[PDB]
Amino acid sequence: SVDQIRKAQRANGPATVLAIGTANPPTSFYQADYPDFYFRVTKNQHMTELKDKFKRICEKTTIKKRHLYLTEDRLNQHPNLLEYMAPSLNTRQDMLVVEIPKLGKEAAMKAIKEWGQPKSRITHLIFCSTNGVDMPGADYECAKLLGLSSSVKRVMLYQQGCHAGGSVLRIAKDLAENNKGARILTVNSEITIGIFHSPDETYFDGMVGQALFGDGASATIVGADPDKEIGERPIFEMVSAAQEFIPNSDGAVDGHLTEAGLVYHIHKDVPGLISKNIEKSLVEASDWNSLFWIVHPGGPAILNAVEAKLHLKKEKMADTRYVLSEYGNMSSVSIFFIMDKLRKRSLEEGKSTTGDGFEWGVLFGFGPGLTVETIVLHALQTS
Amino acid sequence: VDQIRKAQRANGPATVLAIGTANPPTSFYQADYPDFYFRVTKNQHMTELKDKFKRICEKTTIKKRHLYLTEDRLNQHPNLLEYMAPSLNTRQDMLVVEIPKLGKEAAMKAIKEWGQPKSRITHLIFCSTNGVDMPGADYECAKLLGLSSSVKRVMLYQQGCHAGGSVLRIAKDLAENNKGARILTVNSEITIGIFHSPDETYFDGMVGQALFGDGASATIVGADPDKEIGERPIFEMVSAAQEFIPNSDGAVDGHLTEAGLVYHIHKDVPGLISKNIEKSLVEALNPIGISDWNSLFWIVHPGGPAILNAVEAKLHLKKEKMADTRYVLSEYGNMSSVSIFFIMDKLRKRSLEEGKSTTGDGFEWGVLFGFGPGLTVETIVLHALQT
Ligand SMILES: [Cl-]
Ligand SMILES: [Cl-]
C-alpha cells in the first residue's frame, strides 16, 4: 500500500511560480556617492588616493543605486564594524539574526498577498541566507513571524553564496512536484552586515565587495497543479534544474567565516571560467537569442563574458543589468528581482508570454565552487 | 512540458539502499573521560569539579564516545582548551578539513555496500552543524569523493540534531521526483565547534561535553531499485513530516560566536518533547492512526537518556523499541544528526542477524524521529522489507 500512497501523495504537473514578492532596506545609497559616504564613516577621508581608487571601482560596477541596512548611524554605534579586522562577529550576528528573518518576512508577505490563498495552505518553507547562522535558524523565525502552520516542512540554507537563488528554486521544484497540493514558500534574504569591512590595506576584495553587494530580500510561491478556479495564475513553469561546479576553481570565489566577519575572495578568472564553461550546461539543458534570460548579476564582467560567449544582443540582459543598476548584487536574491521584472514587464507590455514573448528561458546562478545553477523555464500566457 | 514531467519522474518510493558509518579512531570511555577532559584543560586539581563532571557523565548512560579532539590535537591548538577564547578561526581551520574528510569515510563505506560506481550518483546532501565555509563541505566532499561535476548538492549548515531526518526528508523528494536519481546523503558531526573547557557554571556545556560525540554517516537513497545490478533495498520512506513545538524556541539554543558554538539545553526539553510527540505522530501518519505504538518499530534520536525515557513512557513503548537507540547512545554518545543513521544501520543489521522477517525487527511499519532546536521534530514513516 506504500506504492498506493506514493501516487496518492505526488503531484502531476511541473512546478510553477505562482507569485513573487521583493523587499529592500529603506535607505538607498547611490553608487556615485557611496565612496564619499564609505570613507567618511570609517574616518578615512584623508586617504584621497585610496578614495579615488574606490571611486573608480564603484564606477565600473555599472551600479547606480543600492539599498543597505548599515546606515551611517548603525556604524557610528558599533565602532568594531569600522575597525579593519577587529572582532565583530557577535555584533554582526546580533543584527543579522533579527533582521534576516524580518526582511524575509517583508518580502514573503508581498508574495503571499499576490498569491491570495490563505497562509494555512503553505506546506513548505525554503529560507536562504548567506549571513546570520543561528539555531534555530531564520527558517523557523520567519515561519514564526509569518504565522505559518507548525507543520511547515522547512529547509534552511546558510552560507551558500550567490548561486543559492537557483538552488532554492531547484529544491522547490522537487518539493512542489513530489507532493500533491504542496505550496512551497521560498525566502531569500541577503544583508551585507556579515561582509562589511573598512577601507583596504591589501583587502580590496572587500572594496570590490563593498561596491558590488547590496541588501534585499525575495520570496516566491512555487506549486504544481495550479488552480485557476480559485485564482492561481502560474508565472513560469520549471522544466529542469541542474547544478555543476567548475572543476578547477575551488579558490576562484571563496568565503571564510572568521571572528571579524565573513572574508570573501573574488579572483579575476571568474568571468573567464564562467564564459569558457557556460556553454556546457546550456547544450545539455538551440538559438540563444530565441530565449529569455535571467542571469545572476554577479558583476558586469561576468555579464559581458556570458553575453559575449553566447552571442546575445543587448536586449537579452536588459532585465538583469537593470537589477544590477538599481539594487546592486544582492547575492541569491538577485535572480528573483530579475524574474519579477521580466514577468511584470511582459504582463504590462501585453507580450504573448510571461517571458518577454518567448516560450523558453534559462536562469543562472553563480557562486562559490565555482558553482553554476541552470534552470530551464517555460513562459506562460498572459490571460 | 507535462510529458517531460512524467518521463523524468520516478515511480516507487524513496528507498535506503546502503548505509555507511565512520568515527574518529580515538575512543574515549565515559568513566575515563573526566580524567582526560580535566587533564587536557589543565584542570587536574579541580577534584570537586571533576567529581561533579563524573556525575553528569554517569547520568548520560554513555559508555564511550569517539572524539576527534585528542590530547595531541588540543595541544596543537591550546585556544580550544581556553574557555570562551577566540578560537572560531582555529575551530574552522580544523572543521573545514575534517568535516568533509570524516564524511568521506562514511561515504565510501555506503558506496562499497551500494556496489555501484560513484558515476551514477546524481545528488549529494551534506549536513553538518559546524564548519560553515564557501564553498561548503558538500563541495569539498564531492571533490574528495571525485563525484560527478554535475551532482546536485544540498548543503545543510548549523541545523542541529533533527537534521538527520531533514536530510532523509529532502532525499525522499529528490529520489522520488527524478527517475534514475541516486541520492548520496552525508552527515558529519564533529565536536570541534562545540568543544569547551570545564566551567562549574556552564551546565549546558558540561552536558554537551559529556553527551556529544564525533561521527559521520552516509546513505544511498533512490527509487525504483535495480536488483540485478546489486542494489538491496533496506527501508522504504512512506511519509516525511516536520513540526516545531510552539513556544519552545528558547528550550534549545545555538549561537555561533567568536568563541565557537554556544548552545543551551534546558531541563524542560524532555517534558516538552513528550507532551507533543503525538502531535507529530498523527501528522506524519497523514490519515492513518495507530491504536498501539508498539505495533511499529522505532528509530528515535538519542538526544539523552531523559528524553528517551519520557518518549518511551509517554507512548508506553516496550523496552525492545529503544534497544537500538540506547545501544548507539551507549556506544557512541549523541552524534547530533548522525545518530539516527547509526540506529537505522543497527536495526537492519540486527534484524538480519536474528533472522527477522523484516529489516525492521519483524515489523512492517516504523517511525523515525529527529529532535533539534525549534523545538523541531522530524517524523518519518518507514516501510520495512521482507527476508
Ligand atoms: Cl505536503
Ligand atoms: Cl537526476
Side-chain angles (χ1 to χ4, degrees), chain A residues 10-11 150 154 174 178 243, chain B residues 9-10 153 173 177 242-243:
Chain A
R10 79 215 301 174
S150 59
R154 296 169 281 113
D174 290 336
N178 205 45
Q243 188 211 34
Chain B
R9 182 205 306 268
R153 290 167 286 112
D173 289 336
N177 194 63
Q242 190 200 40
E243 196 91 10

Side-chain angles (χ1 to χ4, degrees), chain B residues 68-250:
Chain B
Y68 165 84
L69 297 314
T70 65
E71 188 177 307
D72 280 355
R73 287 269 188 237
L74 294 174
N75 281 267
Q76 282 187 306
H77 316 77
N79 40 28
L80 296 215
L81 301 167
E82 301 257 2
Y83 183 71
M84 296 302 151
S87 58
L88 180 62
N89 298 340
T90 306
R91 291 186 160 99
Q92 295 293 302
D93 284 354
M94 287 174 288
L95 283 168
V96 306
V97 178
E98 276 293 310
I99 294 290
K101 178 162 64 64
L102 188 68
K104 178 208 175 185
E105 288 196 40
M108 287 282 242
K109 291 202 185 68
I111 296 173
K112 292 289 182 184
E113 174 190 353
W114 183 30
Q116 316 303 323
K118 303 189 270 190
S119 323
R120 191 181 171 94
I121 299 181
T122 55
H123 308 65
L124 165 62
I125 306 170
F126 200 104
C127 172
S128 176
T129 314
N130 305 111
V132 294
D133 201 18
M134 301 175 214
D138 59 315
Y139 162 78
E140 304 290 10
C141 182
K143 196 174 60 180
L144 294 175
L145 289 172
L147 295 182
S148 177
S149 65
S150 59
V151 296
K152 312 179 190 59
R153 290 167 286 112
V154 176
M155 182 58 258
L156 298 182
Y157 269 141
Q158 294 278 339
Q159 295 308 316
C161 310
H162 65 276
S166 301
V167 168
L168 291 169
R169 171 170 50 91
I170 301 175
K172 178 187 179 297
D173 289 336
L174 303 209
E176 293 170 0
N177 194 63
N178 296 274
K179 183 62 210 303
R182 286 298 172 269
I183 284 69
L184 173 67
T185 74
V186 176
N187 289 68
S188 180
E189 306 291 351
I190 312 178
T191 54
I192 297 171
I194 76 170
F195 180 92
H196 290 296
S197 299
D199 203 66
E200 293 240 273
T201 279
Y202 194 20
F203 156 81
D204 307 306
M206 299 190 67
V207 157
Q209 279 300 121
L211 208 58
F212 291 102
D214 302 351
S217 63
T219 71
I220 291 296
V221 182
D224 313 327
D226 181 15
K227 189 189 65 178
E228 301 300 326
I229 199 54
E231 287 190 324
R232 303 117 63 160
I234 303 172
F235 287 116
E236 291 176 341
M237 282 187 286
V238 177
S239 177
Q242 190 200 40
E243 196 91 10
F244 63 84
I245 304 177
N247 307 319
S248 70
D249 39 321

Side-chain angles (χ1 to χ4, degrees), chain B residues 251-361:
Chain B
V252 176
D253 255 355
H255 312 327
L256 180 58
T257 77
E258 318 176 1
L261 211 222
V262 177
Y263 52 99
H264 292 61
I265 313 178
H266 301 75
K267 215 144 165 295
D268 60 338
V269 170
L272 275 172
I273 293 186
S274 65
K275 306 306 195 316
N276 299 97
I277 274 301
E278 309 193 44
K279 205 285 165 57
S280 305
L281 244 23
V282 177
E283 292 295 337
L285 289 130
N286 198 2
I288 295 177
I290 291 300
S291 310
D292 185 14
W293 301 119
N294 294 289
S295 194
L296 321 144
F297 60 91
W298 295 83
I299 301 178
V300 175
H301 167 258
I307 301 181
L308 297 183
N309 300 336
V311 168
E312 170 178 275
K314 178 68 177 176
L315 303 178
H316 280 92
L317 257 38
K318 306 176 179 181
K319 286 299 177 183
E320 67 185 25
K321 304 300 180 185
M322 295 296 92
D324 299 321
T325 294
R326 299 196 171 101
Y327 167 86
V328 171
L329 178 66
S330 169
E331 293 306 314
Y332 301 100
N334 188 338
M335 297 175 297
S336 185
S337 69
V338 171
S339 304
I340 57 148
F341 298 101
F342 275 61
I343 308 179
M344 175 184 297
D345 186 53
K346 174 64 176 182
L347 171 61
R348 58 123 180 188
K349 283 174 178 174
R350 188 185 55 76
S351 295
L352 301 187
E353 269 189 281
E354 303 173 344
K356 291 289 188 172
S357 297
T358 79
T359 56
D361 227 354

Side-chain angles (χ1 to χ4, degrees), chain A residues 123-124 153 179-180 182:
Chain A
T123 59
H124 303 64
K153 317 179 184 190
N179 294 115
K180 204 194 210 74

Side-chain angles (χ1 to χ4, degrees), chain A residues 1-3 5-7 9-15 86-91 93 124 130-131 133-137 139-141 143-144 148-161 163 167 170-171 173-175 177-179 237-251 253-260 262 280 284 360 368-373 378, chain B residues 1-2 4-6 8-14 85-90 92 123 129 132-136 138-140 142-143 147-162 166 169-170 172-174 176-178 236-249 252-259 261 279 283 286 288 365 373-378 383:
Chain A
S1 57
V2 5
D3 270 301
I5 302 166
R6 193 40 228 153
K7 181 58 218 67
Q9 223 182 45
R10 79 215 301 174
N12 286 112
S88 56
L89 197 282
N90 292 342
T91 55
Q93 290 290 91
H124 303 64
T130 301
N131 298 314
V133 299
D134 193 55
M135 306 176 65
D139 65 317
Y140 166 84
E141 307 285 8
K144 175 182 170 185
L148 306 185
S149 158
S150 59
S151 292
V152 293
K153 317 179 184 190
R154 296 169 281 113
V155 174
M156 184 60 255
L157 302 179
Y158 272 133
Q159 301 258 323
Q160 299 303 270
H163 67 282
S167 298
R170 168 173 52 87
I171 298 177
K173 174 183 193 294
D174 290 336
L175 304 203
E177 288 172 0
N178 205 45
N179 294 115
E237 288 183 330
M238 274 180 286
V239 173
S240 72
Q243 188 211 34
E244 21 253 29
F245 67 85
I246 293 190
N248 58 290
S249 53
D250 62 290
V253 173
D254 61 62
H256 310 289
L257 192 53
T258 67
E259 305 178 15
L262 190 68
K280 170 168 278 186
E284 311 157 348
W360 300 101
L370 298 181
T371 303
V372 176
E373 299 266 1
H378 191 71
Chain B
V1 295
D2 232 282
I4 309 181
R5 181 79 283 273
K6 189 198 71 181
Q8 76 134 273
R9 182 205 306 268
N11 277 51
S87 58
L88 180 62
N89 298 340
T90 306
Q92 295 293 302
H123 308 65
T129 314
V132 294
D133 201 18
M134 301 175 214
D138 59 315
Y139 162 78
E140 304 290 10
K143 196 174 60 180
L147 295 182
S148 177
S149 65
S150 59
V151 296
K152 312 179 190 59
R153 290 167 286 112
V154 176
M155 182 58 258
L156 298 182
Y157 269 141
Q158 294 278 339
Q159 295 308 316
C161 310
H162 65 276
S166 301
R169 171 170 50 91
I170 301 175
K172 178 187 179 297
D173 289 336
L174 303 209
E176 293 170 0
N177 194 63
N178 296 274
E236 291 176 341
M237 282 187 286
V238 177
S239 177
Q242 190 200 40
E243 196 91 10
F244 63 84
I245 304 177
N247 307 319
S248 70
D249 39 321
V252 176
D253 255 355
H255 312 327
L256 180 58
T257 77
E258 318 176 1
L261 211 222
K279 205 285 165 57
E283 292 295 337
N286 198 2
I288 295 177
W365 311 94
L375 288 175
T376 300
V377 173
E378 300 272 350
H383 186 242

